[PDB]
Amino acid sequence: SPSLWGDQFLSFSIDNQVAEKYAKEIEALKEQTRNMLLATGMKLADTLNLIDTIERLGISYHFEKEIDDILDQIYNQDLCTSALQFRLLRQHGFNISPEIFSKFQDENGKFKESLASDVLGLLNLYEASHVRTHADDILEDALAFSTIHLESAAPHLKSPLREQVTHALEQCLHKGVPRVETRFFISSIYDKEQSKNNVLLRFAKLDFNLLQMLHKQELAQVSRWWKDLDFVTTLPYARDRVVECYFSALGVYFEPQYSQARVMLVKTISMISIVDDTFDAYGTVKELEAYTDAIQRWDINEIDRLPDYMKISYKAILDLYKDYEKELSSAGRSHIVCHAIERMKEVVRNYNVESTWFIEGYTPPVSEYLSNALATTTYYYLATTSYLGMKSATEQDFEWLSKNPKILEASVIICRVIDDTATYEVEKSRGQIATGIECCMRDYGISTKEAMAKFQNMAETAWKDINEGLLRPTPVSTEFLTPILNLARIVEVTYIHNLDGYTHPEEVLKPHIINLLVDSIKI
Ligand SMILES: CC(C)=CCC/C(C)=C/CC/C(C)=C/[C@H](O)P(=O)(O)O
Ligand SMILES: [Mg+2]
Ligand SMILES: [Mg+2]
């Protein structure tokens, strides 16, 4: 499919006038909200609720500290309140004990079925059940419990609750994309809340709409940068998904301070997409081998062994990193670009092996499979690329990333296992007997069902691992853990109808793209 979008995102003339109007009133709403947080005699359930709402609306990135000091204090000092308190502290790194859920369970470890009539309690427990780590076996039955009752109780709930419950049973807050969920909360829920806080709603719509202007600009910038390359008329075999790449970079981070980073990350994602397309639906055994080698060396002098068409990809790639080296200059962080590069070569290496395995009809043992198939997700790559733009990222931080941290390793597994479950049958048809599930089935001598079932558990384990990763002390500043977390969210979001949303956007991403980069939240 050619691009659903077309030249539509190419032009964007911001109404500075409008943007200024929005900015000014927002600053005034910022302070009003700030003072809401600083209120002295508030109850626990009112404070936890306040913070929950500000976060969901997507304006919590303004009061990053105010909210931290409040949770810290709440950490150093009913089901609904408990689970919420749990989730919020945990998402922030505070390792609060699960024995809070003790007083809600029987002597036999399970939850009292007498709670089945507490919807708000069941709901917040459901959301909290997704941020559990391996040491939280107390919450082993939290999800199936709250789910079954939520489903049963939802059809007769008043709105918007009913709509909030039905949506959560399809997508939990923790594992969803921030912008996407915020767009859902503001318009479909909080705006329709009878007790909604007018100041916070107003604040929430302006802000979301204002940052949408910036994203619209960014995407424009990237849409012109993508036409001046003409891989649309030059390299027809490749996928034109620059908008979808932007959604991915927007999923990694949306704050305005990451404007430089996002644009950097979009160019990479788009770029590497081409290379997979080359190795997959185009280049030949020899051509690919010549391409992988070319990449590994890295010096334009080689654009020669490469066929004419691979010459274009290769040059574009090298110039992109030269641009990167150039953008950074001002700060003096050009010496970190290499980090992204060594990862890219790693992706290219495996891409090659992947093909080699396809020609020989090799069906590796799962062990050997992942050792190679993990990087081909490009997740170490994007993770490493996401830092480039972050003005705070140091060498000592990339060094952390280069050792393949457990949080990153788990983010990558989630992207691998889910992708292999969602694209088994298709990839198979094409003769690729090297696909996850296959190696799994033959390796463990199990059915397709059992193989997928075992891959799911890998993902669950992975999540439990990512949740631990967020706990303090954090190996690096939380600021650099979130990009990894979000990447995993993006996987969970893109393959929900259990299907490639980036290779088949229409049913999954299109909507998000429309609600995030097209339609503004009507005030
Ligand atoms: C689902 C997610 C988050 C996708 C991230 C995007 C990425 C850089 C795409 C490049 C090309 C891909 C991925 C092809 C196949 O899908 P494959 O890799 O399966 O051969
Ligand atoms: Mg490939
Ligand atoms: Mg796949």
- Judging by beta carbons within 10 Å of its beta carbon (0-12, 13-18, 19+), is residue 449 exposed, middle or buried? exposed
Q: Which residues pair with 111 in a beta bridge?
A: 105
Q: Which CA distances in Å does 257 have to 260, 261, 386, 450, 518?
A: 8, 8, 13, 45, 21
Tokens of 522: 């009507």
Distance CA 168, CA 148 (A): 13
Residue 318 Cα to ligand 1 middle (Å): 21
The number of C-alpha atoms within 13 Å of 408 and in the hemisphere containing its C-beta is 24
Ligand nearest to the CA of 273: 1
CATH class, domain 1-40+196-522, is mainly alpha
Distance CA 149, CA 146 (A): 5
**Which residue lies with its CA nearest to atom 9 of ligand 1?**
273
Calculated CA dihedral for residues 485, 149, 167, 122, nearest 10 degrees: -60
Tokens of 85: 């308190």
Place of tokens 């939850």: 111
Q: How big is the CA angle at 66 (ends 61 and 70), to the nearest 5 degrees?
A: 120
Task: Answer yes or no: is 207 a known binding residue.
Answer: no
491 lines ligand 1 (CB under 6 A): yes
Calculated CA dihedral for residues 263, 269, 272, 274, nearest 10 degrees: -100
Nearest to 95 by CA among 127, 121, 133: 133
Distance CA 348, CA 6 (A): 29
Would you give the DSSP letter of residue 94? -
Nearest to 181 by CA among 198, 191, 192, 168: 168
502 lines ligand 1 (CB under 6 A): yes
The number of C-alpha atoms within 13 Å of 354 and in the hemisphere containing its C-beta is 27
Helical segments of 14-159, H only: 16-37, 44-57, 64-76, 79-91, 119-128, 142-153
Phi, psi (rounded to 5 degrees) for 431? 90, -5
Ion ligand 2, residues whose Cβ is below 5 A away: 276, 279-280
344 lines ligand 1 (CB under 6 A): no
Q: Where in the chain is the domain with CATH 1.50.10.130?
A: 41-195
**Which residue lies with its CA nearest to atom 6 of ligand 1?**
269
Distance CA 3, CA 181 (A): 25
Give the position, in ligand 1's atom list, of the atom nearest the Cα of 276: 11
The answer regarding whether domain 41-195 maps to CATH 1.50.10.130 reads: yes
What contacts 467, CB < 8 A, 6 or more positions away?
90, 131, 132, 133
Distance CA 291, CA 273 (A): 15
422 lines ligand 1 (CB under 6 A): no
Distance CA 167, CA 284 (A): 46
Q: Show me where the chain is broken: residue before each gap, C-N > 2.5 A.
A: 77
What contacts 49, CB < 8 A, 6 or more positions away?
84
Q: Is the dihedral of CA 282, 285, 288, 294 positive or negative?
A: negative
- H or E stretch including 220? helix 198-225
Count other C-beta atoms under 10 Å from residue 326's C-beta: 11
Tokens of 443: 């390796």
- Judging by beta carbons within 10 Å of its beta carbon (0-12, 13-18, 19+), is residue 227 exposed, middle or buried? middle
Rounded to whole angstroms, the maximal C-alpha distance in the chain is 73
Distance CA 158, CA 116 (A): 17
Q: Which residues pair with 105 in a beta bridge?
A: 111
Nearest to 215 by CA among 14, 494, 503, 3: 14
Integer distance in angstroms from the first to the last C-alpha of the chain?
Answer: 35
Distance CA 243, CA 5 (A): 8
Specify whether the CB–CB gap between 119 and 113 falls below 8 A.
no
Specify whether the CB–CB gap between 365 and 406 falls below 8 A.
no
Cis preceding linkage at 473, omega within 30: yes
Distance CA 515, CA 188 (A): 12
Task: Answer yes or no: is 239 a known binding residue.
Answer: yes
3-state helix, strand, coil in the chain (%, to 5): 70, 0, 30
111 lines ligand 1 (CB under 6 A): no
Distance CA 145, CA 109 (A): 12
492 lines ligand 1 (CB under 6 A): no
- H or E stretch including 38? none
Nearest to 84 by CA among 117, 43, 35, 112: 43
509 lines ligand 1 (CB under 6 A): no
Question: Which amino acid does the sequence have at 359?
Answer: I
Residue 427 Cα to ligand 3 middle (Å): 7
Distance CA 60, CA 130 (A): 21
Would you give the DSSP letter of residue 189? I
What contacts 191, CB < 8 A, 6 or more positions away?
201, 205
Ligand nearest to the CA of 438: 3
**Which residue lies with its CA nearest to atom 10 of ligand 1?**
273
Q: Where in the chain is the domain with CATH 1.10.600.10?
A: 1-40+196-522
494 lines ligand 1 (CB under 6 A): yes
Give the position, in ligand 1's atom list, of the atom nearest the Cα of 376: 18
Mutate to test the pocket of ligand 1, among 502, 504, 509 (most ligand atoms within 8 A of CB): 502
Nearest to 83 by CA among 131, 154, 42: 131
Tokens of 258: 């990451």
- Judging by beta carbons within 10 Å of its beta carbon (0-12, 13-18, 19+), is residue 15 exposed, middle or buried? exposed
Ligand nearest to the CA of 385: 1
Helical segments of 92-172, H only: 119-128, 142-153, 161-168
Nearest to 177 by CA among 523, 516, 519: 516
